[PDB]
Amino acid sequence: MTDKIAVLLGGTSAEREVSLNSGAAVLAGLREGGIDAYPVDPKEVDVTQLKSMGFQKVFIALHGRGGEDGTLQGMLELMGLPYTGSGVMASALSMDKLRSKLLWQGAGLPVAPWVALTRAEFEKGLSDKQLAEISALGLPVIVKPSREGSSVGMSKVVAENALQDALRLAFQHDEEVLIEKWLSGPEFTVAILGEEILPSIRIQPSGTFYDYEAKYLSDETQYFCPAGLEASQEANLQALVLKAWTTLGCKGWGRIDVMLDSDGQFYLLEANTSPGMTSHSLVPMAARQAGMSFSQLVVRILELAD
Amino acid sequence: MTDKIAVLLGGTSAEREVSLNSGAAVLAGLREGGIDAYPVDPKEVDVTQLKSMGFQKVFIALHGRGGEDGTLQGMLELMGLPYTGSGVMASALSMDKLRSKLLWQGAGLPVAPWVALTRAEFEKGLSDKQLAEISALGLPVIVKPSREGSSVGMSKVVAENALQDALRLAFQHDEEVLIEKWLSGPEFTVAILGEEILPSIRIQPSGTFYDYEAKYLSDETQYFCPAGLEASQEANLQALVLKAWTTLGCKGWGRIDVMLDSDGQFYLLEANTSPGMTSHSLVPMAARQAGMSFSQLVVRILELAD
Numbered sequence: 272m273t274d275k276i277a278v279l280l281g282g283t284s285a286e287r288e289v290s291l292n293s294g295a296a297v298l299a300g301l302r303e304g305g306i307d308a309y310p311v312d313p314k315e316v317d318v319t320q321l322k323s324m325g326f327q328k329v330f331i332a333l334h335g336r337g338g339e340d341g342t343l344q345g346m347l348e349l350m351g352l353p354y355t356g357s358g359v360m361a362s363a364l365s366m367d368k369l370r371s372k373l374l375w376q377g378a379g380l381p382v383a384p385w386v387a388l389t390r391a392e393f394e395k396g397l398s399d400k401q402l403a404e405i406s407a408l409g410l411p412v413i414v415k416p417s418r419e420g421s422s423v424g425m426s427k428v429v430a431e432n433a434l435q436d437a438l439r440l441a442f443q444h445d446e447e448v449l450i451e452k453w454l455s456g457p458e459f460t461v462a463i464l465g466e467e468i469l470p471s472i473r474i475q476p477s478g479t480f481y482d483y484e485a486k487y488l489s490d491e492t493q494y495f496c497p498a499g500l501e502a503s504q505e506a507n508l509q510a511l512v513l514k515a516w517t518t519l520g521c522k523g524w525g526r527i528d529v530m531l532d533s534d535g536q537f538y539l540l541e542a543n544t545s546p547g548m549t550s551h552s553l554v555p556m557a558a559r560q561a562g563m564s565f566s567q568l569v570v571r572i573l574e575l576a577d
Numbered sequence: 578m579t580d581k582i583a584v585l586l587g588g589t590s591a592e593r594e595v596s597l598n599s600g601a602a603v604l605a606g607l608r609e610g611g612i613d614a615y616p617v618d619p620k621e622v623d624v625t626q627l628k629s630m631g632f633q634k635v636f637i638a639l640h641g642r643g644g645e646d647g648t649l650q651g652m653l654e655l656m657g658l659p660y661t662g663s664g665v666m667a668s669a670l671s672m673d674k675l676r677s678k679l680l681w682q683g684a685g686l687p688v689a690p691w692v693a694l695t696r697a698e699f700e701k702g703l704s705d706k707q708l709a710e711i712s713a714l715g716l717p718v719i720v721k722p723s724r725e726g727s728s729v730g731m732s733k734v735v736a737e738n739a740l741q742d743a744l745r746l747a748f749q750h751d752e753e754v755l756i757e758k759w760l761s762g763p764e765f766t767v768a769i770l771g772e773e774i775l776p777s778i779r780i781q782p783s784g785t786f787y788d789y790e791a792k793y794l795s796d797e798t799q800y801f802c803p804a805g806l807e808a809s810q811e812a813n814l815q816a817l818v819l820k821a822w823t824t825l826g827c828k829g830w831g832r833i834d835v836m837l838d839s840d841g842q843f844y845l846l847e848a849n850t851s852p853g854m855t856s857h858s859l860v861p862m863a864a865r866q867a868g869m870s871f872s873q874l875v876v877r878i879l880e881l882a883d
């Protein structure tokens with residue numbers, strides 16, 4: 272018998288439905304590439320039993336905490352099963368937007384001005400210093416949970432008195448949140464596959480930002496790949512993303528989200544270490560422009576595992 | 578029936594002998610406190626089996642990667658067992674001196690000037706540019722692996738032409754290495770227990786730095802607790818350590834190592850999320866001076882767990 276591969280999909284995060292779609296596509300893609308792969312949903316199957324179940328290797332198609340944040344990676348390390356994507360530290364770090372931003376700023380990489388808040392800071396009342404820092408960002412701002420994906424818990428604030436509503440929403444999803452300066456765009460994303468940086472994609476939502484609807488349900492979002500940048504700027508963007516990726520310590524494959532601001536500079540938003548892999552997701556779109564079918568892409572991601 | 582507690586000790590790192598000593602102390606302290614505790618060494622016992630063995634909670638007294646770096650924490654999270662100390666992300670970051678330094682720099686906290694190198698860079702041979710950056714640090718410098726403890730793999734470089742030998746050593750111990758400005762001292766450490774910062778300790782080794790012998794095997798090291806700082810200065814140190822702790826996201830307990838430099842300012846060296854607990858160890862000294870028995874200290878660390 273050749274290796275048996277578990278495609279972990281679904282799980283229990285806010286991104287469960289996205290992950291069910293990613294894993295459905297990855298399962299078929301791997302089987303098309305001759306890989307003996309099976310779907311396993313950790314919501315229904317105890318993943319501590321994977322080795323007992325006869326699996327040799329794991330393709331992680333989970334998104335969000337519990338699959339993307341180092342916890343599952345640590346279990347798999349101790350179980351001794353090779354797995355796709357980044358290891359424990361870089362997965363945990365990339366899930367935490369607050370600490371990714373601090374790390375990048377420490378490395379001299381460009382990030383949007385921001386204020387971080389804990390639940391205790393917000394619900395016990397903002398200090399004068401915090402209020403001053405928030406005021407200095409101007410409006411609009413965007414508010415995000417630190418540890419979500421798929422634009423869950425995120426919103427744009429257009430009036431001072433409505434910041435509290437954005438903060439209450441974000442605190443429904445995490446214990447720590449970010450208030451960030453609004454960036455003008457345009458918006459890009461850059462996939463990484465092994466040592467290869469894939470062609471950037473320019474993303475144009477029809478509404479206010481690339482929210483859950485714009486990501487998964489709209490026929491109106493526009494995508495440009497190639498992204499239409501002057502060659503030197505595409506190269507700059509690729510080099511920025513490579514430095515962001517290596518600073519975090521990520522490996523295997525992933526996708527970094529980036530926006531221009533009205534000063535003409537790129538700013539890093541976040542890194543994703545288990546990116547969406549629905550048929551129509553962004554990593555497959557960039558890989559298609561670099562000559563890879565979806566099956567070729569997933570077989571390559573798997574080949575990179577330990 | 579009362580909880581059955583596993584004290585994890587020993588393991589397979591360079592710090593194994595220290596950990597066997599830490600775990601022996603912790604075990605006696607817990608039992609002295611009425612806790613039903615038992616030692617388990619992961620080198621001898623398959624730790625993925627703890628819950629199957631009837632354990633309810635885990636006291637981590639391991640030191641170094643694979644006990645301290647988030648991997649074990651992730652496994653315990655998926656097994657559903659509460660455990661002492663920091664979670665996955667903060668454990669992983671605290672083991673990674675390079676990324677701790679970047680995060681702290683991003684947060685505006687004081688860190689010694691440094692250069693980082695990867696193994697691939699070292700194997701290729703160093704560029705004129707990298708040598709230029711290293712040269713800017715001045716001399717002396719210390720060379721350390723990023724992810725070790727107990728002063729393993731470290732050397733003091735007092736001549737420019739001695740750097741290569743120091744790197745050849747540190748690369749035996751990690752794939753990422755730091756070259757840091759040599760700090761004048763004096764040297765301090767600060768224990769954290771729950772929400773409490775304990776009074777600091779001034780550490781005076783007899784040799785060139787606080788090396789493995791000075792830490793565990795010498796009767797010549799001196800320790801001062803209280804540290805002899807002016808009241809405002811002790812308060813400054815505690816505040817710095819609290820910020821450094823909260824920036825990494827650490828919880829439960831730990832210990833942060835700090836040095837003065839010749840500008841009279843404090844600089845953060847590193848955080849340790851499973852600190853030593855031996856008769857030579859620093860957390861027990863801070864707890865003793867703060868009016869706790871060692872048994873009360875370990876019962877408290879356990880009570881703080883999840």
Ligand SMILES: Nc1ncnc2c1ncn2[C@@H]1O[C@H](COP(=O)(O)OP(=O)(O)O)[C@@H](O)[C@H]1O
Pocket residue numbers: 383413415419420421422423425451452453454455458480481482528540541
């Ligand atoms: N500072 C910002 N200004 C404007 N739009 C932003 C900003 N940060 C994020 N966005 C928008 O919100 C989307 C989701 O933000 P991101 O930081 O990538 O979190 P997620 O993990 O949920 O994708 C982005 O794709 C972009 O459309």
Ligand SMILES: Nc1ncnc2c1ncn2[C@@H]1O[C@H](COP(=O)(O)OP(=O)(O)O)[C@@H](O)[C@H]1O
Pocket residue numbers: 689719721725726727728729731757758759760761764786787788834846847
């Ligand atoms: N930049 C430096 N200058 C002078 N001494 C240092 C410096 N960095 C570390 N040391 C010495 O080396 C010891 C161990 O370094 P540390 O960074 O705490 O790593 P470890 O995890 O091995 O303890 C310190 O306790 C201190 O005596």
Ligand SMILES: [Mg+2]
Pocket residue numbers: 419420421541542543
């Ligand atoms: Mg994301």
Ligand SMILES: [Mg+2]
Pocket residue numbers: 421422528541
């Ligand atoms: Mg995103």
Ligand SMILES: [Mg+2]
Pocket residue numbers: 725726727847848849
């Ligand atoms: Mg240490």
Ligand SMILES: [Mg+2]
Pocket residue numbers: none
């Ligand atoms: Mg020589």
Ligand SMILES: [Mg+2]
Pocket residue numbers: 793794795857
């Ligand atoms: Mg002794």
Ligand SMILES: [Mg+2]
Pocket residue numbers: 727834846847
């Ligand atoms: Mg130390």
